[PDB]
Amino acid sequence: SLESYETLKIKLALSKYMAMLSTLEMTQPLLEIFRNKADTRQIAAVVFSTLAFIHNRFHPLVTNFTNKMEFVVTETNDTSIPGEPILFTENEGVLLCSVDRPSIVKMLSREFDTEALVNFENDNCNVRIAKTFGADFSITEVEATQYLTLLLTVEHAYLHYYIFKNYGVFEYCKSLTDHSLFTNKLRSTMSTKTSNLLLSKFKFTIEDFD
Amino acid sequence: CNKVRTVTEIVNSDEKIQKTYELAEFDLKNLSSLESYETLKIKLALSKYMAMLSTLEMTQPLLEIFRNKADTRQIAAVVFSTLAFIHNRFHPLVTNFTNKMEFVVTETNDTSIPGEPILFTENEGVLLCSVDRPSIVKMLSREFDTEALVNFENDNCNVRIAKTFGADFSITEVEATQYLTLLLTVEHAYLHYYIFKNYGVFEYCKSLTDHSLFTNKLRSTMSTKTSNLLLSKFKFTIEDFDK
Amino acid sequence: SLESYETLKIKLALSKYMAML
Amino acid sequence: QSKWICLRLNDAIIKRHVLVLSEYADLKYLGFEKYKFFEYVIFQFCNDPQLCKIIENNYNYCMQIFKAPADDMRDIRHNIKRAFKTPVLGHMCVLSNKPPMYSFLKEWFLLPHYKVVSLKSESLTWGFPHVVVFDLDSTLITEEEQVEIRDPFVYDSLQELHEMGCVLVLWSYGSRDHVAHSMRDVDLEGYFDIIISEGSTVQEERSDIVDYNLKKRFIENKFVFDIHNHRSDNNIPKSPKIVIKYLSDKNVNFFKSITLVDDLPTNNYAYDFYVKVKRCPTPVQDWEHYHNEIIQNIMDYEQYFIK
Amino acid sequence: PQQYINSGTEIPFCDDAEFLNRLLKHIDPYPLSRMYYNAANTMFYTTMENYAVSNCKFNIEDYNNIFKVMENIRKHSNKNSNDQDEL
Numbered sequence: 001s002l003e004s005y006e007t008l009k010i011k012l013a014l015s016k017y018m019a020m021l022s023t024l025e026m027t028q029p030l031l032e033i034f035r036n037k038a039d040t041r042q043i044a045a046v047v048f049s050t051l052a053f054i055h056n057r058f059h060p061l062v063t064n065f066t067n068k069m070e071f072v073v074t075e076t077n078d079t080s081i082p083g084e085p086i087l088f089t090e091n092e093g094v095l096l097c098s099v100d101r102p103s104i105v106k107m108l109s110r111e112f113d114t115e116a117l118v119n120f121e122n123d124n125c126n127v128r129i130a131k132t133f134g135a136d137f138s139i140t141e142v143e144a145t146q147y148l149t150l151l152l153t154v155e156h157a158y159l160h161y162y163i164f165k166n167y168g169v170f171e172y173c174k175s176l177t178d179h180s181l182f183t184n185k186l187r188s189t190m191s192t193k194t195s196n197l198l199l200s201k202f203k204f205t206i207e208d209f210d
Numbered sequence: 211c212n213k214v215r216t217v218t219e220i221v222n223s224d225e226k227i228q229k230t231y232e233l234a235e236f237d238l239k240n241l242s243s244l245e246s247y248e249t250l251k252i253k254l255a256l257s258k259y260m261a262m263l264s265t266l267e268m269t270q271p272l273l274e275i276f277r278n279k280a281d282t283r284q285i286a287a288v289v290f291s292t293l294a295f296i297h298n299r300f301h302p303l304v305t306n307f308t309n310k311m312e313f314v315v316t317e318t319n320d321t322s323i324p325g326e327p328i329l330f331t332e333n334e335g336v337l338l339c340s341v342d343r344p345s346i347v348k349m350l351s352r353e354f355d356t357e358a359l360v361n362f363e364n365d366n367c368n369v370r371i372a373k374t375f376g377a378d379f380s381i382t383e384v385e386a387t388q389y390l391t392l393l394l395t396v397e398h399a400y401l402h403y404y405i406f407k408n409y410g411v412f413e414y415c416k417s418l419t420d421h422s423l424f425t426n427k428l429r430s431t432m433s434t435k436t437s438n439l440l441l442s443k444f445k446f447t448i449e450d451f452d453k
Numbered sequence: 454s455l456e457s458y459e460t461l462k463i464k465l466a467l468s469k470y471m472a473m474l
Numbered sequence: 475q476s477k478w479i480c481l482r483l484n485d486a487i488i489k490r491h492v493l494v495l496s497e498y499a500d501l502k503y504l505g506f507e508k509y510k511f512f513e514y515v516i517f518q519f520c521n522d523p524q525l526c527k528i529i530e531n532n533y534n535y536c537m538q539i540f541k542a543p544a545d546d547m548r549d550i551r552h553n554i555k556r557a558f559k560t561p562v563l564g565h566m567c568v569l570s571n572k573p574p575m576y577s578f579l580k581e582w583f584l585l586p587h588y589k590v591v592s593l594k595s596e597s598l599t600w601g602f603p604h605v606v607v608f609d610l611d612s613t614l615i616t617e618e619e620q621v622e623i624r625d626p627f628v629y630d631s632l633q634e635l636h637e638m639g640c641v642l643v644l645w646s647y648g649s650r651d652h653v654a655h656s657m658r659d660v661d662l663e664g665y666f667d668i669i670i671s672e673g674s675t676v677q678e679e680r681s682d683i684v685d686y687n688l689k690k691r692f693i694e695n696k697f698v699f700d701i702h703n704h705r706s707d708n709n710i711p712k713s714p715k716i717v718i719k720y721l722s723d724k725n726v727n728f729f730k731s732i733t734l735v736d737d738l739p740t741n742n743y744a745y746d747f748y749v750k751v752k753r754c755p756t757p758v759q760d761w762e763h764y765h766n767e768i769i770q771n772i773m774d775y776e777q778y779f780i781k
Numbered sequence: 782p783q784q785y786i787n788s789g790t791e792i793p794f795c796d797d798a799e800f801l802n803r804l805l806k807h808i809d810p811y812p813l814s815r816m817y818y819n820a821a822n823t824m825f826y827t828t829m830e831n832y833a834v835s836n837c838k839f840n841i842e843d844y845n846n847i848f849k850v851m852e853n854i855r856k857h858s859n860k861n862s863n864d865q866d867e868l
Contacts, residue, residue: 001224007813009864015805023795045786052792068787082831096782107827113819118225118812137804141811142819149820167595168489174595179847181597186852187639188600196862200221202814203851204821206841207215207228214841218821218849225814229822233833240833455570458505630858664855 010201017053018139018147024049031146034105044071047099047154054158061191070096077102086157088164088172097161104153111149114142155198238372252440259295259393260386263288264379272385276347279317286313289341292396300433310336315343328399332406332414349391355384362443394438475543477519479529482536482558486513488590490728491564492554496574498525503571511590512567514558516550518574545578548744556779562602562728565718581702581711581743583718596725599639604772605721605732606635607712609673610646610653612737617755623660624757631761632665638772641726642667645712647674650695654687668720671695676702676710693720711741730775733768746780747771802867821849 001007021030024046033039052065074080080100081087085107088097159182164172175181188194212232219226266287275284290311298304316322323329327342327349363370398421405424406414417424454460487510495517501509509515519539520526529537538557542550551563568584608614614628615621623629632642642665646653650671657663672695679700684692698716703709712734721727734742735749742748749767752760774780832839 001222003222008809011808011813012805015801015808019797019801019804020793020795023793023797040784041786044784045789048787048789049791049793056792063792064790065792067790069785070782070787071785072782073784077831077834080831082835082837083828096785103827103831107823110823110826111819113822115812115815118227118815120812121810137807139804139808141808141816144808144811145816145819148817149823152820153824168486170488171595178594178843180843181595182847182850183597184850184852185597185600187598187636189639190637192600194600199849200852202218202220202817202849204216204218204825204849205845205851207217207230208841208845209212209214216822216825218818220814227815227818231826236830236833239830240836243834244836455503458502461505630856633856633858 010198013057014144014148014151017151018144020049020053021046021147030150031105031108034101034108040073040101043101044073044099047071050151050154051158051161054154058158058162058193058197059191060193070094072096072098073101074098075102084176085153088157088161090169107153108146108149111142111146152198235372242373242376249440252438255299256386256390260389262295263291266291272389273350273352276343276350279315279343282313282315285315285341285343289313289339289396292392293400296396296400299437300435308337312336312338314338314340316340317343319344326399326402326418327395330399330403330406332411346392349395350388352384352388355387357384397438475545476541478540478542479517479519479526480538480540480554480557481512481515481517482538483510483513483515484535485510487511488593489513489564490560490562491567491585491590491593492516493567493587494573494576496572498529500571503569508587511587513564514554516554545576546744547579547582548746550579552780559778561730561775561778564728582714593727594725596727598724598726599641601639602728602730603639603641603726604730605641605643606768607643607645607717607732607734607736609736609738610644610656610671611648611674612753613735613751616757617753621656622757624754625759625761627759628761629662629665631765632662641729643670643717643720644668645670645673645717647672647710649674650684654684657690658688668724669693670716670720673699673712674710676700709740711743712736712745731772731780733771735764798865798867 026046027033027042030043030046033043048069048071051069055062055065077100079098080103085100085103086097087099088095090096160172160175163175163181167174182199186194186200212234213230214232215228215230217226217228266284270278275281275288290313322342322345327345329340331338331340366374401421401424402414402417405417405427409427413424413427491512492514493512493516495515497503498517498520520529526539540553540557542553544550544553554563555561565583565585567587567590569587573584614624616624635642644666646669648671653669653671663669670693676699677697679702683694684690698719699713717732721729731746733747733749734745735751736742737751737753739748739750747768749764752758754760829839831837
């Protein structure tokens, strides 16, 4: 593709993501940690860093994400709502958020899918047989896909967070009753990098049955 | 047919992928959890009521009380408490009523009545109630009881095979189970009691000549909350009435 | 309602009567 | 020419919207809780100092006191944005308990308060929007009857403005007919947000479908205008009434500032900024300075005050 | 709430630029869209599950109407964006 370099730039963004992860003292494949009970403090700190990175990319001009934020992993479906694994809130002057670790883990469970027939880059003798005649650092496809998926997850959350920050709980309710305030909008200020934000890159709709 | 279909396409129409699924088994999980927690709620309510009864100085097992007939005290107390609990479940408002009421134990078959072990005289100057201890004991003849049984089912591959794949005073259960008997009985009585307390003795002739029609008066009358009638089949052979 | 505050005024007269007794 | 006072609600349970009162007693018309709907509420200054003193004793809400001899919508807006340090303000609520006759603000949207519930927010911009409104018949077009784009630089500047979220609102006074040709002729609509026509005229209001051209989805250019002033003059101002009406139709409910660009100054009734277009029988490519002007106008609030 | 080790106000950049640049390269052949498809489907599928696991209604409509909705390219021109002239 003549956009191939920009697809590579997107891959580079994901690479920066995962590099920042590896730099922040990642101990074990994060799925293990999320399966674990202790170190939810560490998980929430990592999510804090994630929010910082998101705000950065959205708005590099401003270095400081936020001074502090308050965290709560949640342990039951009753402590959560379908569609929203993450829930910002404000209490009595205190900004806080909460997260459904079990649901996020269950999401991570389903990533089983892997390569099936699609279009593919040129394979030719002139390419490969040339090499055959002559001329840990390991990350598997689905492995990287896990972190990709996790990254993509937080986009929706970040959007809600910003909106609430700018418009209070009433418009938080508005966005939640109707996320169609998202609907097909790149219109923004320049600093918002809106085209840069990954909403654009690819699209889906249900092939409505009946 | 609900074979929901899904398509995704990259920017610039570079690629398009399709998949399809069905709400089947999703609906099953929904129904499962639904009945699960509702049954849990009913169990919790039963436990609550029984516990409440536990305060009442059970010097004796429940059945002993009625096997005695010398008392009326304990009996009327228990009955009144039952009616209180029922009204409370109909009305999330702990309350008290006309603060005079009283009771009689009918003690002869020749003073008994068909069908209903309980009856109210709504205002003989004031409310009064009468109850059949003999028949109560006859219900207490629980040599009836035995657990080892088998539920009816149907269409399991669609319907039930899915459900196949999921999982001092320390008194036993059978007696507790028996509690449900008087629970449901007093419910049926409360229905008529409420009805005539709100309405005419003409529709206390009716409701007693048959219960039947009172569904109409219950229309717009019920509290929008269900009671104690989960398992939807409750019937026998009928056409065999063989008149 | 443009009468609602007057209904509240009726509530007020009511409570004024009530509290004395 | 009056002194003025304003409530500032402590808990911004609803933001940005503001109200104007005929009586301090109007609280009784409002009843309970609904004061929580209105972030700010202006009232003319107390004649009796005891009223202001009781107000000063009340702690239930913050308040401000000021002079606004300038009996003007936009000037009042500016002053209030100064007072409360806020770039944007909501609509002005009204009731059948008829407002004070501050009719110098006559030409404006008035919210019959209960619509507050009807106040959806909107997707249309992720920033608070600036808006610019335009005309066709003699505004920015070349004066030749077959108008030309004065500059393709402008043509693309249209889309570029989306970087800032400036909303682009043509109201031709000319009939829909020439616009009907223009649309096919040049996809300015493909670069441009909102279009209206028929604004040329006002009608003697008294108490006594266009889609077929090319299967379009475009507005009925309805008779929404009124006499409004009923006076011996000949003015057809660009109407905030209709404009904001169409905005809320687009669910557009808030804006930073709105500029009118046209060849007729008279229609400007104290618009935030007016761009008197230089009528031109040639493609002048003069847009560079128009750009610069508008940009600086926007920047005016970079200092937190338009000046 | 207790689950917050707040005040970690780092602003990291961890400029392992060239090492990351090379480490990227062994990921290059992976089919981007086909791989993305996995995550997209999983997200949808779990979100679907949860509403049934709370007996909710759902506006499948709204879902489509909102999420991954597609704007439209219209411009005839070009714009300047970030890049790194590495090395």
